[PDB]
Each structure stands twice: as structure tokens, then as C-alpha cells.
Amino acid sequence: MKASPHRPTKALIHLGAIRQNIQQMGAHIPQGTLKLAVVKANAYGHGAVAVAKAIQDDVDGFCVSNIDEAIELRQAGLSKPILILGVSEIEAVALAKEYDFTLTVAGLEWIQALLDKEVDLTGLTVHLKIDSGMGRIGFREASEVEQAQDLLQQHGVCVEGIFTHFATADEESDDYFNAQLERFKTILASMKEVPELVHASNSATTLWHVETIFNAVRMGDAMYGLNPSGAVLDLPYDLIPALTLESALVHVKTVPAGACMGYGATYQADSEQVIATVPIGYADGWTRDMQNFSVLVDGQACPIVGRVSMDQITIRLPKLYPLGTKVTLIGSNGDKEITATQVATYRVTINYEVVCLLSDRIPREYY
Amino acid sequence: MKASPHRPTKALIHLGAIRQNIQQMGAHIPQGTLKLAVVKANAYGHGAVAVAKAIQDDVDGFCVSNIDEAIELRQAGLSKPILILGVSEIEAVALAKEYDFTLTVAGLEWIQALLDKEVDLTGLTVHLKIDSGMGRIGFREASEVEQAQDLLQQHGVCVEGIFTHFATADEESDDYFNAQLERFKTILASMKEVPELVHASNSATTLWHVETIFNAVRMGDAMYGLNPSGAVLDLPYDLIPALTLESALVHVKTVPAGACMGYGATYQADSEQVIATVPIGYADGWTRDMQNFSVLVDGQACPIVGRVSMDQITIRLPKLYPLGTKVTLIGSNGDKEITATQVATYRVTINYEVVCLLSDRIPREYY
């Protein structure tokens, strides 16, 4: 989808909030700890380039999900280290050396495919991924790690770091987290040589298991001011939500009792009422399950009535308003606020998904 | 999100399927009927520019949701008429006039605001929207419409068309559909001068209510080979889905009973089994509610086990397969097929939203 600047629907991104969030996390981790800003998925829908430029001088490096996301940052002028967190294609070892990226290595088969293809590996920097119980990617046994470490170093790869990832750091129970931490430590303890940069901590590990931090933290959701646990756990200190989502009224009508709104005619006015149309819909990532959720107009909750269309929603207003009146979908308006977490809860999902699905059709504006 | 060509996740768009679907619709409507290709929301996530260029010679116009989508078509050299379906901003009308876009006009308040800005509207082409029971945008009263048509003509605006839209053309029951149709016809009958180009028919109306077609059809879902009713109604003739979604294995392991996958550790292997990782996740629009749905690998259904991550899913394979083995998420694979309708039903949504949410991180390739 192409950014639509001539439509009044927009996402506002408070870059200072992101900076402040990084500061508050910094104030609460040990002194030498490296801060890696996770800006995968276009900085969780906030804008990877604009966010990276705003905060570069405050972090030690970036993390992205794939090499194309890293390339995007390099082309824009970002100069700090970038770690690609997932598996890369064989056809991208050469690029890492040319753009100066660090790659994650997670399995023997992958290394053996790279060796078979006979690519030169000499300049390459990598981190080894350990699967300590997330079951997603990484070496699962100590012997596998060392065999991989031996084989990489001998083809001249620099094995710089080693990391794992936690599945349950954002839950009340700490049993699964503890089991993973111990697995990871035992695997590190059995290596004859441990890579110099060891890291395991996502946002939730940083916020609730601060005493378990290794040499770096990978800051995601918290950087954007989002509670990684959603509504489950209280933050140990305040985070400011970076992203706000707004639009305006483009049609306002009074309808008599009996009038139906939307596909399926699933909503029927029981009395005379004011119905307004707002130019956002599911192609913008305001999904169909937002029906009956409220937006804010002039400090008041207005329900989305009838089905969400591809490009438009109809809402019920408490009275007549002019064309162009501001609609707040995420953010504050009057004395009321809607958070991305509140949106995720309504949809039965997590705030990560809400912000990522905000489509590129909505322009991002920065302040 | 930026297209990631160095990752093996891609959407294949068969332009020949789209061509055949338009031809198929043409064969089942009167020979004189104009066909307008609806390519809002980046052609429902299929690629508005590439789809528009592929089919331009076979259609009489394009429909988009806003001026910026219209500009994107023009800047790529499309020359056919472009109708903007939703309300346009007042500040954007001068730009629209320079590009010869056809704008939708839906309310008197809007027209008044436009005239208050003293911008020259001479030669602007518009269509009037009639709300006949969609309750979204458009004139609801016969006299509202003629006041509008009069005000516009007095300022040199050319009123070329008039349209309405149906809320329930894709349902078994025809009651609401018929009331809308009669309301529309009653409106048109009450005007002293009906604009030349009358249209009302979306995909569902075109498919299931052929006898109701006016001068033109607006082809949406059916053009992409998608059943507008999902699984509710049988198609009157064959449609070929245009979009296939595929990826590849990037990690493969065998885990014993007891091993857990994904965030929250919500899936625990109850037997030794093969688990592979595929680089697609909810930031690509493969949403978290896809957990426990299956993808296809080597003609076999393989469930998504554990939570969907932002960039990755883990699936259970029936035996070992090498890295790079193709995964089909939407499309055919061996003797099996997964449709966007099946995906939609699983999520409790409609196929429109499935394809619209496939983010731009997925490159489109055109066949």
C-alpha cells in the first residue's frame, strides 16, 4: 500500500518518547551493558529508518529480522552495528561482508549448505543462536554448538557473539524462564571457548528479570513504550507510547430509526442518531474485528457501528459535528485515552500485532 | 515494511488468472456493459500498478479508494479514467482536476465547503453517490441529489455518473438487496436529468443479480478470483484465484516428547516429531490467529504449532525435509490446495481482509 498523504488518516510517532524509553531502560541496567535497538518489521510499524536515525547516538547497535531490513538502514546512512536475528539465505553471506552486517547462525545443515556452495566466508561476523526452549531456531545441544563453532572458525568466520531468546519472560510464573536460563548457562559452561558477546534479554527480561542480563539487551516493545506483557504485568517504571493514530470525519448524517449501516446490514439504528464516516478501514490494518470498539471524538467514546469496510468505518456520534472533526483511534483526546494494548485486548491479540499491521497506506509523521 | 527479496517468502500473482476472470465476467453480462476494475488498497494487496497495466486494454476504467492511489496509477502511465470511490479532501480537488480523476460526491456539506474555498472547478468530472441502504456515504433523498447536481453544474462541474453500492448482494436472502435496488431506481426516476453513466453492481451483484446491471459493473473480489460470499454461495462459473503465498524451510530439527515451541510455550510435543521454521510471521500479515491452521509441504498438511512470532512460524512435518523445501500457505501443492477463503474462515474474517493484510515485506512476483 502506498502512503496516502491527501487522506486525513495518519500515524504520529513521538521520537522523544522512544529516546526517553531507552533512557529509562538504561538507568535500570548495569553500567557496561550494550543496548541493541530492535527495529525489525519497520521498527514495529513506527518506521525503521526514522526511528534508527533519532536514537542512533543512544544505542550500541540495531537488530533486524532479515538482511533487506539491514540494507535499508545502511542505504539511509546508519553506521552502528546491525545484527540480523533470523536465518539468512546462503546468497547473503557476500552481502553481509559488503554492507557490514552480522548474521545469526542457527544450524549445522545451514553451514554445510554454505560450504557446499563454496562461498568465501573470510570477512564474515556471526552470532551463534542457542535454542534454550523457545523451540524456534538455534543449536539445542552443547556438542552441536561446538562443532559449528569449530567449522566456522576454520573457514575464517569471526564468531563474535552468542544468544538465546525467552518464550515466557512476560508471564507471572518464572518456571519456564528459569529452566531456559539454566539450559543456556549450562550450554555456555560446557564450551571450551565462549564467544565474547553473550546476550539473552528481550524487553520483558530487561524489565522483570534485570538481574539475569548478560553483556547486552535487545530492546523491542518497551522502546516503543508498549508493555510487552500487554495488561498482565505492571511495568517497574513508566514507558511512554510512541505511536498515535488519528483521522477526521468525511461524512456526517442523521439517520431515522430502522436505518442499517454496513455490509450485512448488521447494525440497525433503534432511534434517530448521528452516524459519521471516517476514512480508515481494514486495508489500513484497522481490522474487521474492531466493529463495536470505540474511537474518541471531542473527548467522547463513539462506537464503530456496522461492519468495517476496506477503506472506511461508520461511527455513532453523541451529536452533530462538522466535516473535518478529529477522530482519535489510538491516543488521547479530551480526558480519554485509547492504548494499542486496549486495542489488542479487544481483538484477542497482542500490541505487537496491532502496530505491525498498521499499513503503509497511513503516512507516519514524526515529532 | 519494505519488500524483502532476499528472504524466500513471496506472493505469486498470476496476471493471466485476472485476465481470464475479467473475460469470464464479460461473457456472463450483456455485451455492451462497461467493466471497471476495482484496484483500491493496492489491488486488494495484489499490486495496483502491475495489475492495472496487465489488464488496461480489457477494462473501461479503474476504481480506487483515494486520490493518492489514483496518482500512483497515473505516475505509472495508466491512461484510462480513474474513479475515486470515497470522499476526497477539499484541499485535494484542485490536484484531482489537473490529473483528470473522477471524484465521488456524497453530501451537501462537503460541496458547500468546496465552494467556500474559491477554487476553480471548471471541467472537474464527478459521480454522485446514492446511499440506498449501505448507510456509509451518499445522498439519501431524491431532492438532495438534484440540489447537488444543480450546484455542481453551476460551477462548471461535469456530472458524468451516479452510483450506489449494495450491502447484501452476496447473501442467500434477496430482501435487503431488492429494497436497495428499488430505492435506487426510485431516486433515479425522480430526477429530471439522470447522469449518463449509471452503475451499482459490485462482484456479488454481477455474479448473482445479473439482470440488475445498469451501464457498468465494478469488478473487485471476482476479478482476483475470490468468491465474494466466501463459502456461502456457489459461484455461477469458474473463477481462478490470482494470489499464491509461499515460503521455504529455513530451519529443521527433530524434538523428543516434552519439547515446547513458541511464545508462552503453548505447544508441547506429545511425541518425537520434526519441527521446521518458516520465515513468515504476523508482521507479514500472517496473523497470530493462524496458530493450529495448516500449511502445505510436499502435498501434505503440516500444522502451525505454537504461537506465531513477528517474523517466523514453526510447523510440524511428517518426516525430515531439507532446508529450502517449498512451503505453500495459500495455493496448490501436490493434490491439495489452501484458498484465501479457507484462511478467512479459520480467522473468522473474509478473504478481502486476508489478501489486504499481506504486508509489503512480502515481495510480489508477476506471472
Author numbering:
A (entry chain B), B (entry chain A): 1 to 367
Task: Give passages from the manuscript.
The lack of alanine racemase function in eukaryotes makes this enzyme an attractive target for antimicrobial drug development. In all of these structures, Alr is a homodimeric enzyme formed by a head-to-tail association of two monomers.
Here we report the crystal structure of alanine racemase from S. pneumoniae (AlrSP). Crystals diffracted to a resolution of 2.0 Å and belong to the space group P3121 with the unit cell parameters a = b = 119.97 Å, c = 118.10 Å, α = β = 90° and γ = 120°. AlrSP forms a homodimer in which the two monomers form a head-to-tail association, typical of that seen in other alanine racemases. Each monomer has an eight-stranded α/β barrel domain (residues 1-238) and an extended β-strand domain (residues 239-367). The pyridoxal phosphate (PLP) cofactor is connected to Lys40 through an internal aldimine bond and resides inside the α/β barrel domain. As an incidental finding, the AlrSP structure contained additional electron density within the A monomer, at the end of helix 1 in the N-terminal α/β barrel domain. This planar density resembled a carboxylated aromatic ring, therefore a benzoic acid molecule, which fitted and refined well, was modeled into this region, even though the compound was not added to purification or crystallization conditions (topology and parameters obtained from the Hetero-compound Information Centre-Uppsala, HIC-UP). We observed electron density consistent with a carbamylated lysine at the NZ terminus of Lys129, as seen in most other alanine racemase structures. The smallest constriction in the entryway corridor of AlrSP is between Tyr263' and Tyr352 of the inner layer, which provide an opening width of only about 2.6Å for an active site inhibitor to pass through (the distance between the closest atoms of these two side chains with the van der Waals radius for each atom subtracted). A cluster of hydrogen-bonded water molecules forms an ordered pentagonal ring and some adjacent partial rings in the active site entryways of both monomers of AlrSP.
